[PDB]
Enzyme design. Sequence first.
Site, mmCIF file in Angstrom:
data_model
loop_
_atom_site.group_PDB
_atom_site.id
_atom_site.type_symbol
_atom_site.label_atom_id
_atom_site.label_comp_id
_atom_site.label_asym_id
_atom_site.label_seq_id
_atom_site.Cartn_x
_atom_site.Cartn_y
_atom_site.Cartn_z
ATOM 1 N N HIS A 54 89.993 47.433 47.971
ATOM 2 C CA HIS A 54 90.675 46.307 47.346
ATOM 3 C C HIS A 54 90.212 44.968 47.902
ATOM 4 O O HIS A 54 90.571 43.927 47.343
ATOM 5 C CB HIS A 54 92.196 46.461 47.487
ATOM 6 C CG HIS A 54 92.743 46.055 48.821
ATOM 7 N ND1 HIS A 54 93.096 46.969 49.790
ATOM 8 C CD2 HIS A 54 93.037 44.836 49.331
ATOM 9 C CE1 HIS A 54 93.562 46.329 50.848
ATOM 10 N NE2 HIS A 54 93.537 45.033 50.595
ATOM 11 N N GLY A 58 95.267 39.665 55.440
ATOM 12 C CA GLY A 58 93.883 39.487 55.821
ATOM 13 C C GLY A 58 93.387 40.421 56.898
ATOM 14 O O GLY A 58 92.259 40.243 57.375
ATOM 15 N N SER A 114 93.570 43.970 56.521
ATOM 16 C CA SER A 114 93.131 45.249 55.982
ATOM 17 C C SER A 114 91.679 45.489 56.374
ATOM 18 O O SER A 114 90.872 44.560 56.454
ATOM 19 C CB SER A 114 93.283 45.282 54.461
ATOM 20 O OG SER A 114 92.421 44.349 53.837
ATOM 21 N N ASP A 170 91.229 53.814 48.748
ATOM 22 C CA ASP A 170 91.073 52.392 49.045
ATOM 23 C C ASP A 170 90.046 52.185 50.155
ATOM 24 O O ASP A 170 90.240 51.371 51.060
ATOM 25 C CB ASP A 170 92.411 51.757 49.424
ATOM 26 C CG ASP A 170 92.373 50.246 49.361
ATOM 27 O OD1 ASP A 170 91.405 49.700 48.789
ATOM 28 O OD2 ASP A 170 93.307 49.600 49.884
HETATM 29 C C1 LIG Z 1 91.540 47.666 43.307
HETATM 30 O O1 LIG Z 1 91.398 48.992 43.769
HETATM 31 C C2 LIG Z 1 92.401 49.414 44.662
HETATM 32 C C3 LIG Z 1 92.377 50.855 45.205
HETATM 33 C C4 LIG Z 1 93.465 51.329 46.179
HETATM 34 C C5 LIG Z 1 94.594 50.344 46.619
HETATM 35 N N1 LIG Z 1 95.646 50.801 47.559
HETATM 36 C C6 LIG Z 1 96.704 49.876 47.971
HETATM 37 C C7 LIG Z 1 97.795 50.346 48.949
HETATM 38 C C8 LIG Z 1 96.712 48.425 47.421
HETATM 39 O O2 LIG Z 1 97.742 47.533 47.818
HETATM 40 C C9 LIG Z 1 97.429 46.134 47.519
HETATM 41 C C10 LIG Z 1 96.464 45.542 48.606
HETATM 42 C C11 LIG Z 1 97.369 45.766 49.865
HETATM 43 C C12 LIG Z 1 97.263 44.714 51.013
HETATM 44 O O3 LIG Z 1 97.464 43.562 50.821
HETATM 45 N N2 LIG Z 1 96.943 45.245 52.354
HETATM 46 C C13 LIG Z 1 96.873 44.412 53.575
HETATM 47 C C14 LIG Z 1 95.905 43.203 53.521
HETATM 48 O O4 LIG Z 1 95.825 42.468 54.453
HETATM 49 N N3 LIG Z 1 95.054 42.929 52.359
HETATM 50 S S1 LIG Z 1 94.028 41.552 52.459
HETATM 51 O O5 LIG Z 1 94.795 40.356 52.830
HETATM 52 O O6 LIG Z 1 93.091 41.661 53.586
HETATM 53 C C15 LIG Z 1 93.168 41.305 50.860
HETATM 54 C C16 LIG Z 1 93.979 41.200 49.549
HETATM 55 C C17 LIG Z 1 91.808 41.999 50.753
HETATM 56 C C18 LIG Z 1 91.882 40.477 50.915
HETATM 57 C C19 LIG Z 1 97.192 44.705 55.039
HETATM 58 C C20 LIG Z 1 98.207 43.936 54.183
HETATM 59 C C21 LIG Z 1 98.819 42.631 54.734
HETATM 60 C C22 LIG Z 1 99.855 42.002 54.155
HETATM 61 C C23 LIG Z 1 100.542 42.528 52.871
HETATM 62 C C24 LIG Z 1 100.582 41.380 51.820
HETATM 63 C C25 LIG Z 1 101.590 41.730 50.691
HETATM 64 C C26 LIG Z 1 101.044 42.923 49.848
HETATM 65 C C27 LIG Z 1 101.921 44.183 50.139
HETATM 66 C C28 LIG Z 1 101.252 45.461 49.604
HETATM 67 N N4 LIG Z 1 102.095 46.591 49.945
HETATM 68 C C29 LIG Z 1 101.881 47.904 49.312
HETATM 69 O O7 LIG Z 1 101.061 48.043 48.462
HETATM 70 O O8 LIG Z 1 102.691 48.990 49.747
HETATM 71 C C30 LIG Z 1 102.630 50.152 48.954
HETATM 72 C C31 LIG Z 1 101.365 51.096 49.446
HETATM 73 C C32 LIG Z 1 101.781 51.570 50.701
HETATM 74 C C33 LIG Z 1 102.661 51.260 51.959
HETATM 75 C C34 LIG Z 1 103.355 51.653 50.607
HETATM 76 C C35 LIG Z 1 103.733 50.910 49.209
HETATM 77 C C36 LIG Z 1 99.878 45.645 50.257
HETATM 78 O O9 LIG Z 1 99.795 45.786 51.434
HETATM 79 N N5 LIG Z 1 98.641 45.642 49.416
HETATM 80 C C37 LIG Z 1 98.547 45.449 47.768
HETATM 81 N N6 LIG Z 1 95.675 47.983 46.495
HETATM 82 C C38 LIG Z 1 94.614 48.928 46.084
HETATM 83 C C39 LIG Z 1 93.513 48.445 45.095
#
Ligand SMILES: COc1ccc2nc(C)c(O[C@@H]3C[C@H]4C(=O)N[C@]5(C(=O)NS(=O)(=O)C6(C)CC6)C[C@H]5/C=C\CCCCC[C@H](NC(=O)O[C@@H]5C[C@@H]6C[C@@H]6C5)C(=O)N4C3)nc2c1
Length: 198
Positions: free
Chosen positions: A76, A156, A158, A100
């Site tokens: 993602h 930021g 992940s 992911d």
């Molecule tokens: C397109 O193809 C695909 C394939 C598989 C896939 N699989 C995922 C689980 C997913 O989720 C997206 C991204 C991830 C995230 O933001 N991850 C970080 C992060 O930092 N990203 S990032 O800032 O670096 C960025 C966007 C890259 C630049 C660590 C977080 C930090 C803060 C959260 C911010 C609010 C968001 C809360 C949210 N929560 C949550 O989804 O909870 C759910 C899933 C499991 C726990 C349960 C219920 C969340 O975390 N999401 C939302 N998208 C995909 C997409």
Amino acid sequence: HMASMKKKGSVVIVGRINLSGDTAYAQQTRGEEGCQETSQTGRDKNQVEGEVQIVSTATQTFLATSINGVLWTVYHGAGTRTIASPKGPVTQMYTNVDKDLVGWQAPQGSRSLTPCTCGSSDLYLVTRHADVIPVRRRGDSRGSLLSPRPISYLKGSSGGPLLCPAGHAVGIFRAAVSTRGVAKAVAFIPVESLETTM
Ligand SMILES: COc1ccc2nc(C)c(O[C@@H]3C[C@H]4C(=O)N[C@]5(C(=O)NS(=O)(=O)C6(C)CC6)C[C@H]5/C=C\CCCCC[C@H](NC(=O)O[C@@H]5C[C@@H]6C[C@@H]6C5)C(=O)N4C3)nc2c1
Ligand SMILES: [Zn+2]
């Protein structure tokens, strides 16, 4: 039109989380302007060091972690993008949207974390600000923060590692479980899933 169709840029390493000494701290190695230029050419001549890289696209910034000679990050963030390298764009050698997860060959100069075989549930999450957050493992791919904090502090990060007490890689940070904006738990890609993908 076909003559007009653009190409997405490469993922660019813009810094690292220094875990060398006793004080974790983030280092930037490339600015915005340099990142833009490097994303377009895919040619990155900067020396790479360490296990945890800070990476950026034109629109996102996140982390990537070297484990067993593979630089791992989240789909993602990276999509199917190449990563910039001294000799040009490098194509992913692993891509799993269901997990992911994506991976490139670890860049020359980087160091790799060893997969954990300790079976311990006392973990540590490394964020993009060099924060080391204690996390208790609660399942195959979940863990709870010992000290919850707003999701803003995890955004930021992940692609960053969850580590065991001995510094082994236990997983890759994927998602945050938020309640009223407070992150109480995290989801990660277990290192076993990486070893199976390999
Ligand atoms: C397109 O193809 C695909 C394939 C598989 C896939 N699989 C995922 C689980 C997913 O989720 C997206 C991204 C991830 C995230 O933001 N991850 C970080 C992060 O930092 N990203 S990032 O800032 O670096 C960025 C966007 C890259 C630049 C660590 C977080 C930090 C803060 C959260 C911010 C609010 C968001 C809360 C949210 N929560 C949550 O989804 O909870 C759910 C899933 C499991 C726990 C349960 C219920 C969340 O975390 N999401 C939302 N998208 C995909 C997409
Ligand atoms: Zn271990």
